[PDB]
Amino acid sequence: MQIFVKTLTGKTITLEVEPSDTIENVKAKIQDKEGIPPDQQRLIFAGKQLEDGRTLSDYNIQKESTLHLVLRLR
Amino acid sequence: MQIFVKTLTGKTITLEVEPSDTIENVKAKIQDKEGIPPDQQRLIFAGKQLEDGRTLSDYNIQKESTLHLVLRLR
Amino acid sequence: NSLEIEELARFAVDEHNKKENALLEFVRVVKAKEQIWEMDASKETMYYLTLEAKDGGKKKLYEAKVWVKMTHWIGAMNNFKELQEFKPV
Amino acid sequence: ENSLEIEELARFAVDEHNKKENALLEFVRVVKAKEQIWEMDASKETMYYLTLEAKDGGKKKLYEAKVWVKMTHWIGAMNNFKELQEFKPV
C-alpha cells in the first residue's frame, strides 16, 4: 500500500509499504530515499509517537495514511 | 567560535566554527555531527536562507549566534 | 474568521514589505478563497487572498498566496505559515 | 493584559492532559503565571509555568502546568510550536 510522510512545513514524500512492515523498517525506507538516519526520525500517527519494534498494523495505519516526521537532533 | 543550530521544535546542537567558514562547510559540520545530508539542510539566519557559497562573516554570524534548520525532503 | 483572514492578509503585506522594502499600507480584503487538505494529525490550507493596499496613498489591488499547515499530536501542536506569492493585478 | 493568551495556554494544558488521560478536568481560572524567556536570532523560546484551577469531580483543585512555546520567524514564513511538558497536582 501507499503512505505519506510530511515535515511540519508540509514537505511530502510517499512510500510504498505493507501493513506487516515495522516502524523500524519504515524509518529505514525513509533513510534510503532521503538520507535521514533513523536515529534522527520521530514518526507521528494518530496523535502518538510510533515505537520502532512495533508494526504499522498495530497503529492501524491503512492505505493513503499520512505520517508526520520531526527531526530529533539527538 | 561556537554557534547553535536548532530545529523548529527547539532541538539544539553545537558546532565549533570560524567566521572564515562557508555555509557549505557548516552543513558538512552538521552532516558529520548528526548524519543529516547537506541537501536536506535549509539553514536560516537573520531572516534569510543561507547560500552555500557565502561565509559566516558575510552573514554577520558571530559567536553564540543561533542558526535554524528546516528539512527539505529533497 | 474574517478577522483571521485579515491577519493573514496583513501577514502577506508585512512580509512582502520586508522582502522588497516596499511601503504598502493595508486597506482591506476584497476576496478570499481557500484550498484545504485534511489528513491525520494535520490540516493544510492554501489561502488565495486578493487584498487592497496603498502604494503612494492611492489604493491598489494585490494577489497574495499564503500557505498554512497546522499539525497536532498528543500534548503538542505546531502552526506554520508561509507567504508564497505576492503580485499586483 | 496578555492574559487571554495565558488562558488559552492553560486550557491547552488541560485539554492535552485530558486527551492523554481521559480525565475531563474543567478549567476555571489561572491563579499564578510565571515564564522564562530565551531571546535569540529569529526566535523567542518561552517556558510557561502556569498554576491553574480545575474541577476534578466538581470539586475545584490546583494544578501546575508547564508549556513550552517556540516561535520562529524568517522572511515570508512563520512557525509556532507549543508543547505540554508537565501536568501535576500540588
Domain boundaries, chain B: 1-74
| H or E element, residue D4 | helix D3-21
Take residue B66 and report the three cell numbers written for it: 543561533
DSSP for D33-60, please give it: EEEEEEEETTEEEEEEEEEEEEESSSSE
Experimental technique: X-ray
CB contact under 8 A, C40 and A8: no
| Resolution attained, angstroms | 2.8
CB contact under 8 A, B36 and A35: yes
| Phi, psi dihedrals of residue D74, rounded to the nearest 5° | -145, 170
Give the torsion through C-alpha atoms of C5, C79, D69, D7, to 10 deg.
50
Per-residue buried b or exposed e for C26-61, using 16+ beta carbons within 10 Å of the residue's own CB: beebeebeeeeeebbbbebbbbebebbbeeeeeeee
C78 Cβ under 8 Å from any chain D Cβ: yes
d(CA C42, CA C26): 30
Helices then strands, counting H and E runs in chain C, come out as: 1, 4
- Determine the distance in angstroms separating the CA of D59 from the nearest CA of chain C, rounded to an integer: 25
d(CA A3, CA A33): 14
Residues 7-36 of A with CB under 8 A from C: 8-10
Domains of chain C: which residue ranges? 1-89
| Phi, psi dihedrals of residue C20, rounded to the nearest 5° | -125, -10
